[PDB]
């Protein structure tokens, strides 16, 4: 169904003296979270959302919980290992993050594979596009590189990527495919705000849309105002949908010379709006 992705976001954060490291695995289908493991519980387990639960069965999630706890403890060792690599004191907090998964094309074939690591928020090591070689970011990661090169880690990942990862993704759709069902078109409107003197601000709002990708533009009699334009980062409404706005400062009395354009994949075609003053 066009290209699709299965991606896992992994976080391991040490907190010496204040407990065991906090470990999390978060799985996303097409940027939609569908499962989460969080080690910060008395008896922690995989928490698949309703669909993946019982459309997969209890045994399965049991086994993934056990695999999660296995990963958790392996990462515990890694945090200790990296202290050594970087000659860091044992008393500070550090983080390891991974993005791991695959993207398939509409033909079901693997388009892209992900296996990338960061330490304290900087790139550490990553599997290259060729799915055979590794890019180490620094001297510490060269130690991990040599070690994986020896054990053939890259080949271990290709098998997962082309086997398990890709197959999970093919399984999800058919069965469902719920990111077009989750498509929501923006509803737009322009607001009007006073500036000092003879300028006014026109603010074009896009609300209640999913997915997050969107474009807002202002045009003055054809020709995007490719500057002087203010906007905010797209932001979640908290109900699943997103918001954005773009504003321009225009002369008082000339508000009808400006048009806002809204481009979103949910729309039959770009929205075009102007400031509408009540009468």
């Amino acid at each position: 169904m066009g290209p699709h992705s299965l991606r896992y976001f992994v976080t391991a954060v040490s907190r010496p003296g204040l407990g065991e490291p906090r470990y999390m695995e978060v799985g996303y289908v097409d940027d939609t979270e569908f499962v989460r493991f969080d080690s910060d519980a008395e008896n922690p387990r995989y928490e698949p959302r309703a669909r993946w639960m019982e459309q997969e069965g209890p045994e399965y999630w049991e086994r993934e919980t056990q695999k999660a706890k296995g990963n958790e403890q392996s990462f515990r060792v890694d945090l200790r290992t990296l202290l050594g690599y970087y000659n860091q004191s044992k008393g500070g907090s550090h983080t390891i993050q991974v993005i791991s998964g695959c993207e398939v094309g509409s033909d079901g074939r693997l388009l892209r594979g992900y296996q990338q690591y960061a330490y304290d928020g900087c790139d550490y090591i990553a599997l290259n596009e060729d799915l055979k070689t590794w890019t180490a970011a620094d001297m510490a990661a060269l130690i991990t590189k040599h070690k994986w090169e020896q054990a053939g880690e890259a080949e271990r990942l290709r098998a997962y990527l082309e086997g398990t990862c890709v197959e999970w993704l093919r399984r999800y759709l058919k069965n469902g495919n719920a990111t077009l069902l989750r498509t929501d078109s923006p509803k737009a409107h322009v607001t009007h705000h006073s500036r000092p003197e003879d300028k006014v601000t026109l603010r074009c709002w896009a609300l209640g849309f999913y997915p997050a990708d969107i474009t807002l533009t202002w045009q003055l009699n054809g020709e995007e105002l490719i500057q002087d334009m203010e906007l905010v980062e797209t932001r979640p409404a908290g109900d699943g949908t997103f918001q954005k706005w773009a504003s321009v400062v225009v002369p008082l009395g000339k508000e009808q010379y400006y048009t806002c354009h809204v481009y979103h994949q949910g729309l039959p075609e770009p929205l075009t709006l102007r400031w509408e003053p009540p009468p």
């Binding site: 896992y8 992994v10 695995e25 799985g27 993934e64 695999k67 999660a68 296995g70 990963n71 392996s74 990462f75 060792v77 890694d78 290992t81 990296l82 390891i96 991974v98 791991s100 296996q115 690591y117 550490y124 090591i125 991990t144 070690k147 994986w148 054990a151 880690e153 271990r156 990942l157 997962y160 398990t164 990862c165 999970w168």
Partner: peptide, 8 residues
Amino acid sequence: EIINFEKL
């Protein structure tokens, strides 16, 4: 389904 991770 996430992979099994290997030691750094």
